[PDB]
Amino acid sequence: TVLPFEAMPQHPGNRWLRLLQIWREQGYEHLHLEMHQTFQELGPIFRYNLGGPRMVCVMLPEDVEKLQQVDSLHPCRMILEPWVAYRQHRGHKCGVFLLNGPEWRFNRLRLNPDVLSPKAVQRFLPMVDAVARDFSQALKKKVLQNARGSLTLDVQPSIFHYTIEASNLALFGERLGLVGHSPSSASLNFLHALEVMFKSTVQLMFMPRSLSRWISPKVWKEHFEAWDCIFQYGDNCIQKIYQELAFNRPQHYTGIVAELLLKAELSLEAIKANSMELTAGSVDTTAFPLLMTLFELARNPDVQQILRQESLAAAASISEHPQKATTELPLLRAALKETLRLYPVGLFLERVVSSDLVLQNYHIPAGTLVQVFLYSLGRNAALFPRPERYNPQRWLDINFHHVPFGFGMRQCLGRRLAEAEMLLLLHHVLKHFLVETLTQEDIKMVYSFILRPGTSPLLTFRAIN
Ligand code: HEM
Ligand SMILES: CCC(=O)N[C@@H]1CCCc2c(-c3ccc(Cl)c(F)c3)cncc21
């Protein structure tokens, strides 16, 4: 028994007043909380009144399963008009994140062997380990200068400079010297450019180019100015590596981008495009869940202890061969799966379905936008018993339950790189320090394309020596 599409519960809010409030509020900060509240009132499935196109919202893994079967050769995501507009204007190609169809497949297949593949992970993992080591060592130096052998600080700036340092070394094979040193003007500008880029995305996301072009021209100006800065930073990296490789082909591994340039399977302008997305992509996406794991470990000392015991046992083997960290730290990997469950990076998994399907016994026609709301999915007390409870052990009992990086062929390209940056930092921090905090109040998240914390709590790093 299958019900028609219009039989599905509808969102009570209308598209026009929705447009008007973003113009008034300069963004959609609360979106995650608003959508979560809607699911509690209308059920695990509802249709959004987009006024013509079909838009469906889901929050169940059983829906994610069915959504993967309809993926096809070319899984299609909604076109992100503000980002694409910048590429067209400046004459740049689109990377694997913004592409669709056969153009996406060509790029993706030529990127997987050097960005995501296990053989590639074995090569960039020891590089990331060196950065992660330097972070803990630099921290230990400042901790031992205090009488109590502890340092209480806002970790957010330092963690952000780690994700910049670790990503640049993994991608380009260049140490920027940000870990253990004062932040560079160039890095601070890049971070702010990203901050502004995401802010302006939300404002321009919901309305057509036609409307936004005269209603919000200064939002458009602000968005492009932010991208001009992001692109300036990324192009500087690409110009350095291209000149270095033009004069000498190295025998040893010197980063992800180096491998892509040497293989030359993709055009320079496509390597430039994809490398830009990997450079800008890896900063905020890796740092925010790293910061949230640190907070949740500071909150749950009992959980921390188990993870510390695991990391101190596997310390000797990871010191000799860093690539072991993946296989020898199941609890820490499960702690990361837990952090991403409670605190997702984005909010929606998008799919513009290629053929008809049945979701929650409702008919879903072809060309329907299906959005998987990750914030709500992580909170279902039937699938994730005690959902408010930060318990990594839950992942070792168990399927489409864990899906923060997505699914199928379109599933996150940086997934393995992000995992390595997170694992290795936490491993070295747990080895030498005890994280603590008096802030036991949950941090309020802010929707600015990337679901980011509104507060950065004070964390005490106490040395074990
Ligand atoms: C650790 C947190 C991260 C999460 C949760 C995450 C999650 C996601 C999700 C859900 C997708 C799309 C999956 C889909 O639609 O099927 C995705 C795509 C992508 N991510 Fe991330 N990501 C993370 C880190 C990274 C990092 C560090 C980078 C930069 C290297 C990155 C680069 C990308 C790219 C290029 C894509 C596009 C994949 C494609 O269209 O083929 N991500 N990410
Ligand atoms: C629902 C999960 C999700 O999409 N998270 C976030 C959304 C914000 C951007 C993003 C990226 C990404 C960020 C910036 C650029 Cl330039 C890019 F090219 C890709 C990669 N990976 C995850 C995510």
Written account of the structure:
By secondary structure, this protein is an alpha+beta fold. The chain has a single domain (1-465), classed as Cytochrome P450 (Cytochrome p450), CATH 1.10.630.10. Helices cover 55% and strands 10% of the residues. It is built from 18 helices and 11 strands. The chain has a 4-stranded mixed sheet. Strand 1 and strand 2 form a beta hairpin. Helix 6 runs antiparallel to helix 7 (156-172) and helix 8 packs across helix 10. The protein is globular and about 65 Å long. Protoporphyrin IX containing FE binds next to helix 12 and helix 18.
The CATH topology is what?
Answer: Cytochrome p450
**What's the CATH architecture name?**
Orthogonal Bundle
CATH class category: Mainly Alpha
Element order: H for helix, E for strand? HHEEHHHHEHHHHHHHHHHEEEEHHEEEE
Heterogens: protoporphyrin IX containing FE, the ligand CCC(=O)N[C@@H]1CCCc2c(-c3ccc(Cl)c(F)c3)cncc21
Cα-to-Cα separation, first versus last residue: 65 Å
Adjacency order of strands in the biggest sheet: 1-2-7-4
Q: How is the biggest beta sheet arranged?
A: 4 strands, mixed
PDB class: oxidoreductase
Keywords: cytochrome P450, CYP11B2, aldosterone synthase, oxidoreductase
Assembly: monomeric
Entry title: Structure of aldosterone synthase (CYP11B2) in complex with (+)-(R)-N-(4-(4-chloro-3-fluorophenyl)-5,6,7,8-tetrahydroisoquinolin-8-yl)propionamide
